[PDB]
Amino acid sequence: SDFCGQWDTATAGDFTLYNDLWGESAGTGSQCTGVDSYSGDTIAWHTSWSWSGGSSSVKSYVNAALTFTPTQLNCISSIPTTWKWSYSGSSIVADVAYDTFLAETASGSSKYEIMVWLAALGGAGPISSTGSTIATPTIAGVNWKLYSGPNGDTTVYSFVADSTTESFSGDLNDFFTYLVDNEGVSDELYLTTLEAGTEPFTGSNAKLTVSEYSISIE
């Protein structure tokens, strides 16, 4: 049982699974998402898609999103996360990233967006001022590349893996703690969003098989 609508959704345990085809108007094609297994803080799912056109423009952000209360960084002890996935299909240009947001109120529009890219396929890349790394940190047993750029009234910070990580496990809080210590993000800001998903631009007979995914806030 899947869904193929631009705004079709599904609730499973701690999560809402979003087809969210926000840029379907920029290209030509199809995308269908569905739940495979869920229990509590863990989920499994898949999105098959083929997009052509708009090599620049993202067609969708199919993501599983945790349902939680906005919480201050200085209250977070740990955000344990496990993510195992696989991608089939040809000419895949797309990413697979954790995606989060920090506001100063638990409601106001966002001030920082922090992403952790488990994969950058076929050309996909983060927002950047210079195009160059601002740091190459080693965090949660992975060597990352950190980039940074403006988005409206929001600094976007993206951690990209040096190589494609089909299996990942660790404390996602670390990425915040590092930004707070090294990039001057206020420990008082509220964590409002925690999403793990994939944004494709173009590809053929694709399928992102997320074999297990689990995340919590302690």
């Binding site: 620049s56 993202v58 529009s109 983060p126 195009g131 750029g149 988005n151």
Partner: protein, 404 residues
């Protein structure tokens, strides 16, 4: 009473003009109209296929004839003349022409909005507009019957609706690159909502003063100002680095030369040779600085480039941004690659800024492509322009309005 209004817009593929749809005439017909942001009025082709029972000629020396901006009176047909016939001069700006035109009233009907979806239909029984000959449709998108003027007059859509329905004299407009789905313009008040859940309001947009060119480029009235929309660029930055230009050209003079205006008639942003050279050179210079290489110049573009190290981002291709720095140093119209670049095919990306010769009336003209996927709000009452930035940054597009 509606708070606001919403019309669809869509990009015609042959011409690259933005095309909208209103309802006019009794019985109502759907009219496709080219959007001319600067235009002075709605003008529609009034030939023998204009059949309506609610059409009325506007007489000269009437209240509605003064409002129109009609400087003259009366008409001479051919084989004799007519005393006072409220003549005006509807303009096709794509072909730099003006024919003569007769003011008239007829019913116009569009959709109301609460700013998030399509509301109940509302109506202006006697909407003031201009007739015109079929010839003024030269080189306009197929299917269209006239031109939607959004300029700064009493009888142009935004102030005339504002006046008709008694809401704030302002309109936002959200252009798209899709020939596929509907884009929208929204007349009336904020906040504009774009699916899934992206709210855009006056608290959210960036504001620069809206400047008035005291002499008209619109060069058909003596000592009559331009009804167009100019904003105050102080410098251009290409990834944090100021490009060496003549800053005198940026400023509107005594004679009305130079400065920056926004338009929907120009599909790509027209740059005067002096600014064009500097912007293009520096853009190439910086693009090579992140290993993005130059390829043959495809028409109609100056610079074009390989997609070999062109990374795809949410904000477009990974090219330097062009920041137009406005009245302060912290107020900037940022232009990412989705707004600067133009895909020719899979392997080539061109810069979407064209050269406009020298001795052009306006130094910088911000064009259609550079407006695409930005919410751009024009407040005529308080004389300002507010802008969202690339809506792709918030993961929405100008085609995400819940239109029906």
């Amino acid at each position: 009473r509606p708070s606001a209004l919403v019309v669809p817009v869509k990009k015609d593929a042959s011409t690259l003009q933005y095309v909208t749809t209103i309802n006019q005439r009794t019985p109502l017909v759907s009219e496709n109209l080219v959007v001319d942001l600067g235009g002075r009025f709605l003008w529609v082709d009034c030939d023998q296929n204009y059949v309506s029972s609610t059409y009325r000629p506007v007489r000269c020396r009437t209240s509605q004839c003064s409002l129109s901006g009609s400087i003259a009176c009366g008409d001479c047909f051919n084989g004799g003349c007519n005393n006072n016939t409220c003549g005006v001069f509807p303009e096709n700006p794509v072909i730099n022409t003006a024919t003569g035109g007769e003011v008239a009233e007829d019913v116009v009907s569009v959709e109301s909005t609460d700013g998030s979806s399509s509301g109940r239909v509302v109506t202006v029984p006697r909407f003031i507009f201009s007739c015109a000959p079929t010839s003024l449709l030269q080189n306009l998108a197929s299917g269209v019957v006239g031109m939607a003027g959004l300029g700064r007059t009493r009888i142009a859509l935004p102030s005339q609706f504002a006046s008709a329905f008694s809401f704030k004299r302002k309109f936002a407009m959200c252009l798209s690159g899709s020939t596929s789905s509907n884009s929208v313009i929204i007349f009336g008040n904020d906040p504009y909502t774009f699916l899934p859940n992206i709210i855009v309001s006056d608290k959210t947009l960036t504001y620069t003063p809206l400047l008035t060119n005291p002499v008209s480029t619109s060069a058909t009235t003596q000592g009559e100002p331009s009804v167009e929309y100019f904003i105050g660029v102080k410098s251009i930055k290409i990834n944090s680095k100021i490009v060496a230009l003549n800053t005198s050209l940026l400023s509107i003079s005594s004679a009305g030369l130079g400065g920056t205006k926004i338009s929907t008639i120009n599909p790509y942003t027209v740059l005067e040779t002096s600014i064009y050279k500097a912007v293009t050179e520096a853009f190439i210079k910086e693009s090579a600085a992140r290993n993005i290489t130059r390829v043959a110049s495809v028409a109609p573009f100056g610079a074009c480039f390989s997609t070999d190290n062109i990374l795809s981002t949410r904000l477009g291709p990974s090219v330097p941004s062009i920041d137009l720095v406005l009245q302060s140093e912290s107020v900037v119209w940022t232009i990412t690659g989705s707004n600067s670049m133009v895909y020719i095919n899979d392997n080539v990306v061109c810069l979407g800024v064209v050269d406009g010769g020298s001795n052009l009336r306006t130094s910088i003209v911000i064009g259609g492509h550079q407006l695409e996927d930005n919410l751009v709000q024009f407040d005529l009452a308080t004389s300002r322009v507010g802008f969202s930035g690339t809506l792709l940054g918030s993961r929405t597009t100008c085609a995400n309005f819940n239109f029906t």
